[PDB]
Design a binder for these strands. Structure first.
Ligand SMILES: [Mg+2]
Length: 853
RNA sequence: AACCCCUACCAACUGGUCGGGGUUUGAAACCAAAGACGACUCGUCCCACAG
RNA sequence: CUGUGGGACGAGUC
């Protein structure tokens, strides 16, 4: 550990790679401001990790905002730009006139605040609010009660402010853009902090109660053999249990490190199977616990001790040092060798294991955890399980990478430190630990609470159709009021329980209702081709036979295609009338529940199919949302660099302004006058003597003055000369520069702007049902999504387009399939980044998993 | 495997082979999540039916 | 407070 530990790795130390975007200096100035560009390459990687977390946050916040807007259903964006600002408290929001001093005495602002308060009151009165059971509702006793208006307004305004921070990229919008999330402590009021603390404290109290109801087991041995006081042992055991896997710890402790021991003279645990028969369990746990405790104690004593040493005498703990050693290995046997003698160096706890072999509360509340973690937990309450898992896993991985880089940097010799504007990342280890702890319980809790009449209305709509307001009476007089005109029913509500347990309790239906209208979700599900495609995808997983046996069970050999067709026919034409006519079977119980089980399985299959369709559509849309967010971020970065790019006119002129700036010399103008200026290709040809390897073959032997030299070589030299003026390394390649310049001459700014706006607004998920019956073949969700998007664009601006875009629209209308050329024209704004342009415009590199085809 | 970089051969060099690299490319190092439905084991919670 | 079934979540393999 003398002046270097693992500093010889090529990843940490190496020549400056001159990143393709060319924004490394600008990013370092904005985030660090005191780093040397040509000395290291770790700060740029940290900034890239920050950019990745910004992208993933933008995606998930856009999804959550769309879900909230869909749930509200007031034809106006409740969460958006200029609505529900975080700078206004609940008292000012409810009474803007009495608190006019806070609104800088603006009449229009006060009127807007009053309108927003009316909208918030209507949203609170909306029975659909029960879908966000974990956010706007709390469980007190048996039933769920509505939280106070202060907390609901705090949550809504915090989400709106986070959405503003996602797409602000401004200099003065009553907030500090790009750092509001990183400075929540000095920007949020006390009410928002209290609301976040209460939301965290509910779950922490539930976890403490659950642990105390089952803490009698661990206290018998963990708190006795090791001599740890039980009061300060529950937290340690909980942290060990959450972080006993390779996902969080970073290295194997139980499966490999634990078995690496017990091979020495202390093999009595494994060899003597008589006494060590029913006690090996929890003894392996004790060994893992002591190893984890030693590692975390070493990490904690190394941390908070190198703070005194400014930059040089800082040390690195064995934690993540073992991880760096493992990552340097490139073979399975090398990992075993690394674990070997590492189990011996770590074997300084001989007394602890000797005591172990003789074997036969307070939790961190919201006041201690960071505001970012509480805000992320609140955001997860608007998403669903897979989305929560993906977002939190990405966040913890990126924060772990940032922590590792920030620990490595002092050893390398980099003195770069965050300015007092992005100092939130200086404690990335605590943020990652809190995010892991939050992920440990983010899946807990009932997603839907306080089942109302509107929920059963939506359940009927997603199942049946061909009804009207008559369904209101058909629900009221059958589900809750059947004993008399208005008296509640006895324990004879089996139909209501069936509906709840088969629709409301299912998370797939919650995902559907968060992003789609149940009637529209029923209308889309009636398409035979899409259902057959989903069933084929399910079959290709390597399930159709199981579904057929559990739904249309017939003990006889049948073809897979026949079973898929039968399942499609069952799914197609789904109606609530079949369940309504057989309510007697539903209300019965016993061995005759075969029909009930078949109905449950059919409903589950239908919900699974439609949920898969919706999830694929929203993921594909979110990819382009991320792409446009990256485009806007890069536009901001290039503007800060010093290039002539207008950010205010970016939306008016389309998001291709970055591509035009990076292309080089402007050409999209009637008064070009650049061909005469680009006549330096002749001088370049005359100066070909510098390249002594090409001159004997270019114009000395293989001249071909007829067509190759004159018509082809001169044009290629002109194109290369236009390419050498590119401001980005991606477009410095002649091929990509020529492709981008050719594409820039056919794009329509209005079409690109509309496509970006509808991608951000997730407009495809609204008209997917309407624009799905006019498709000849559904090869993949990519083609489906892009055909729907092109159909929406046509329906908006068919008559307001001219040129090749009109030809592409006509081709889409005639040939019912997505247009690749139109897709390239729409992805032209992504053209400055070649991999992003190719992935988002070609149906061969878009999906990571579909690369096998 | 899309993109970028490196050694060698060749090559308008906007092209190919030979190998190596890429957390500093792209949802994109590794793990993990998703794709991906479904099955089993160990613990917790909730719901329904009974005393 | 005690039993029988279903659902959700934490941990690993197909
Ligand atoms: Mg990256």
């Amino acid at each position: 550990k003398g002046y270097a530990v693992v500093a010889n790795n090529p990843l940490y130390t190496g020549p400056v790679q001159q990143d393709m975007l060319g924004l490394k200096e600008t990013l370092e100035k904005r985030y660090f401001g005191e780093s040397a560009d040509g000395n290291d390459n770790i700060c740029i990687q940290v900034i890239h990790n920050i950019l990745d977390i910004e992208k993933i946050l933008a995606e998930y916040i856009t999804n959550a905002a769309y879900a909230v807007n869909n749930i509200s259903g007031l034809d106006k964006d409740i969460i958006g730009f200029g609505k529900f600002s975080t700078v206004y408290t609940y008292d000012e929001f409810k009474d803007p006139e009495h608190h006019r001093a806070a609104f800088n005495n603006n009449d229009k602002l006060i009127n807007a605040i009053k309108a927003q308060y009316d909208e918030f009151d209507n949203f609170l009165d909306n029975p659909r609010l029960g879908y966000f059971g974990q956010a706007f509702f709390s469980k007190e006793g048996r039933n769920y009660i509505i939280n106070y208006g202060n907390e609901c307004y705090d949550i809504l305004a915090l989400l709106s402010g986070l959405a503003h921070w996602v797409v602000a990229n401004n200099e003065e919008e009553s907030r500090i853009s790009r750092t509001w999330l990183y400075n929540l402590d000095k920007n949020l009021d006390n009410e928002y902090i209290s609301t976040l603390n209460y939301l965290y404290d509910r779950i922490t109290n539930e976890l403490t109660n659950s642990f105390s109801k089952n803490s009698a087991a661990n206290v018998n041995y963990i708190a006795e053999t090791l001599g740890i006081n039980p009061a300060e042992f529950a937290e340690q055991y909980f942290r060990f249990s959450i972080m006993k896997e390779q996902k969080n710890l970073g290295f194997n402790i139980t499966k490999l490190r634990e078995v690496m021991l017990d091979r020495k003279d202390m093999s009595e645990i494994r060899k003597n199977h008589k006494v060590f028969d029913s006690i090996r369990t929890k003894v392996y746990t004790m060994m893992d616990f002591v190893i984890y405790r030693y590692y975390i104690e070493e990490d904690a004593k190394v941390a908070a001790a190198n703070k005194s040493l400014p930059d040089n005498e800082k040390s690195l703990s064995e934690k993540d040092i073992f991880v760096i050693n493992l990552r340097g290995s490139f073979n399975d046997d090398q990992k075993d060798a690394l674990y070997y003698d590492e189990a011996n160096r770590i074997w300084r706890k001989l007394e602890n294991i000797m005591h172990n072999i003789k074997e036969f509360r307070i939790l961190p509340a919201g006041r201690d955890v960071s505001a970012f973690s509480k805000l992320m937990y609140a955001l997860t309450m608007f998403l669903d399980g897979k989305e929560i898992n993906d977002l939190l896993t990405t966040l913890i991985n990126k924060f772990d990478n940032i922590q590792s880089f920030l620990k490595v940097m002092p050893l390398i010799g980099v003195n770069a430190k965050f300015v007092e504007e992005y100092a939130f990342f200086k404690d990335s280890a605590k943020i990652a630990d809190e995010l892991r702890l939050i992920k440990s319980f983010a899946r807990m809790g009932e997603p839907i609470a306080d089942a109302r009449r509107a929920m059963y209305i939506d359940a009927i709509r997603i199942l049946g159709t061909n009804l009207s307001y008559d369904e209101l009476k058909a629900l009221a007089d059958t589900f809750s009021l059947d004993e008399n005109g208005n008296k509640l029913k006895k324990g004879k509500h089996g139909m209501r329980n069936f509906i709840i347990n088969n629709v409301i309790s299912n998370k797939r239906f919650h995902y559907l209702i968060r992003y789609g209208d149940p009637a529209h979700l029923h209308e889309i599900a009636k398409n035979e081709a899409v259902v057959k495609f989903v069933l084929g995808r399910i079959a290709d997983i390597q399930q159709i036979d199981r579904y057929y046996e559990t739904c249309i069970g017939k003990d006889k050999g049948k073809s897979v295609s026949e079973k898929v067709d039968a399942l499609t026919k069952i799914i197609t034409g789904m109606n609530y009338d079949q369940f309504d006519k057989k309510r007697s079977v539903i209300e019965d119980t016993g061995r005759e529940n075969a029909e009930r089980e078949k109905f449950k399985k059919i409903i589950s299959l239908y919900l699974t199919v439609i949920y898969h369709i919706l999830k694929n559509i929203v993921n594909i849309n979110a990819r382009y949302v991320i792409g446009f967010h990256c485009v806007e971020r890069d536009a901001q970065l290039y503007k800060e660099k010093g290039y002539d790019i207008n950010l205010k006119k970016l939306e008016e002129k389309g998001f291709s302004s970055v591509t035009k700036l990076c292309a080089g010399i402007d050409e999209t103008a009637p008064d070009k006058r650049k061909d005469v200026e680009k006549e330096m290709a002749e001088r370049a040809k005359e100066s070909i003597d510098s390249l002594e390897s090409a001159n004997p073959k270019l114009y000395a032997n293989y001249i071909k003055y007829s067509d190759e030299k004159k018509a082809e070589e001169f044009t290629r030299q002109i194109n290369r000369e236009k390419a050498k003026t590119a401001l980005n390394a991606y477009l410095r390649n002649t091929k990509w520069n020529v492709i981008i310049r050719e594409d820039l001459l056919r794009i329509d700014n209005k079409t690109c702007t509309l496509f970006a706006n509808k991608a951000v607004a997730l407009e495809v998920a609204r008209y997917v049902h309407a624009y799905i019956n006019d498709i000849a073949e559904v090869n993949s969700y990519f083609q489906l999504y892009h055909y729907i998007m092109q159909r929406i664009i046509m329906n908006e601006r068919y008559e307001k387009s001219s040129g090749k875009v009109s030809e592409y629209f006509d081709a889409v209308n005639d040939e019912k399939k997505y247009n690749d050329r139109l897709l390239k024209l729409l992805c032209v704004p992504f053209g400055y980044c070649i991999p992003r342009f190719k992935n988002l415009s070609i149906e061969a590199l878009f999906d990571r998993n579909e690369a096998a085809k």
